[PDB]
């Protein structure tokens, strides 16, 4: 249940393209998630209302959360699987006061794939797509183990 060195290299090679504009990519990832799975909006404080006023795009809340989610994820991916230090607190924040089911982590993983396919088709071929899916699977499987310890079924 790990990635090979070459799988990690594929992941970090395409992540280079995301690092050029973390905030723009992160906002896009969340929009993708909310369009494909609008039920995920219920987990935030401000996006349902912004959406109700046709104001999600360019909002301060989308900017803040877009930066947060991909800044954090990039730090985790660069650990290449040795990420317990990051995932213990991250699981706690997504399993306690805010309860984020694993299916929603699955959905944002799919959203990341779709955004990268759309924005960087020439840098996101078959092997890179498979490796990124596998990294994101590892990412939520290790979160899910911590969910179990935390008493959250996911």
Q: Is 125 in the site for ligand HEM (CB under 6 A)?
A: no
CB of 93 to ligand HEM, least distance (A): 4
Q: Is 87 in the site for ligand HEM (CB under 6 A)?
A: no
Structure-block tokens of residue 35: 């369009």
Cα of first residue to Cα of last residue in the chain, in angstroms, is: 20
CB of 58 to ligand HEM, least distance (A): 19
Q: Using CB under 6 A, pick the residue from 32, 94, 134, 146 that binds ligand HEM.
A: 94
Helices (H), 2-125: 5-19, 22-36, 47-52, 60-78, 84-95, 102-119
Residue 100 to residue 126: CA distance in whole angstroms: 30
Structure-block tokens of residue 48: 């349902």
Q: Using CB under 6 A, pick the residue from 62, 69, 115, 135 that binds ligand HEM.
A: 69
**Which positions touch ligand HEM (CB under 6 A)?**
40, 43-45, 68-69, 72-73, 89-90, 93-94, 98, 100, 104-105, 108
């Amino acid at each position: 249940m790990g990635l090979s060195d070459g799988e990690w290299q594929l992941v970090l090679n395409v992540w280079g393209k995301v690092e050029a504009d973390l905030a723009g990519h992160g906002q896009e990832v969340l929009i993708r998630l909310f369009k494909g799975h609008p039920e995920t909006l219920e987990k935030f404080d401000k996006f349902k209302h912004l959406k109700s006023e046709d104001e999600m795009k360019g909002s301060e809340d989308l900017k803040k959360h877009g930066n947060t989610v991909l800044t954090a994820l990039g730090g985790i991916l660069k650990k290449k699987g040795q990420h317990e230090a990051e995932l213990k607190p991250l699981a706690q924040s997504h399993a306690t006061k805010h309860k984020i089911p694993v299916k929603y982590l699955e959905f944002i993983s799919d959203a990341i794939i779709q955004v990268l396919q759309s924005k960087h088709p020439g840098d996101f071929g078959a092997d890179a797509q498979a490796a990124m899916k596998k990294a994101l699977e590892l990412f939520r499987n290790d979160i899910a183990a911590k969910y179990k310890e935390l008493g959250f079924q996911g």
